[PDB]
């Protein structure tokens, strides 16, 4: 499969999440995603086919993972925006007030601004600390998907937030949305990963 931020993958033939970003760990191909999407050794599929397995994860506390891919996969420095792409360039972290977009298999490509940092989410499994908050909308299945600026600076991966009864927070105003992502930088350093860029 071609590995693009925002696309669907399944975990052990069960849950669905979204790809964060193509990465390498030395010669090993991978993608970053949310930790809550899978346990270590869980099997990832795209397009019906096995693409790799969860190599490592932290959730709760943090919410991060990377999937270790077979060599047959094609890593791409791209995030889905409809049928277009955003080119991944780097991982410069944007400040509160910056515009940012996110990409995922349920709500697609959604944009807003960064509204707060260092937010705790009190999930049923436990707290996850240190999350960045934006007001782009999101919904169930977008987890793990890319957060990126227009200029291609990868920000992080979708964790969670204030899901409404319809499964998303797109039906409430931006001012009421809490859409939380795990910062990319600590994922890259924790696991020794490099972005694939273009």
């Amino acid at each position: 499969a071609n590995i693009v931020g925002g696309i669907e993958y399944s975990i052990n033939n069960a849950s669905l999440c979204s790809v964060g970003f193509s990465v390498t760990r030395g010669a090993t191909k991978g993608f970053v995603t949310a930790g809550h999407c899978g346990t270590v050794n869980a099997t990832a599929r795209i397009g019906g086919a096995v693409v790799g397995t969860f190599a490592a994860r932290v959730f709760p506390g943090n919410d991060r993972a990377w999937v270790s891919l077979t060599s047959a996969q094609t890593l791409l420095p791209r995030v889905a925006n409809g049928s277009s792409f955003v080119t991944v360039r780097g991982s410069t972290e944007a400040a509160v007030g910056a515009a940012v977009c996110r990409s995922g298999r349920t709500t697609g490509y959604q944009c807003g601004t960064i509204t707060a940092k260092n937010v705790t989410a009190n999930y049923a499994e436990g707290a996850v600390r240190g999350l960045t908050q934006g007001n782009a909308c999101m919904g169930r299945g977008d987890s793990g998907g890319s957060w990126i600026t227009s200029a291609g600076q990868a920000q992080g991966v979708m964790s969670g937030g204030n899901v409404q009864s319809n499964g998303n927070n797109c039906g409430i105003p931006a001012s009421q949305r809490s859409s939380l992502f795990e910062r990319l930088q600590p994922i890259l350093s924790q696991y020794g990963l490099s972005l694939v860029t273009g």
Binding site: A34, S159, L180
Partner: peptide
């Protein structure tokens, strides 16, 4: 808040 919920994960996703």
């Amino acid at each position: 808040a919920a994960p996703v």
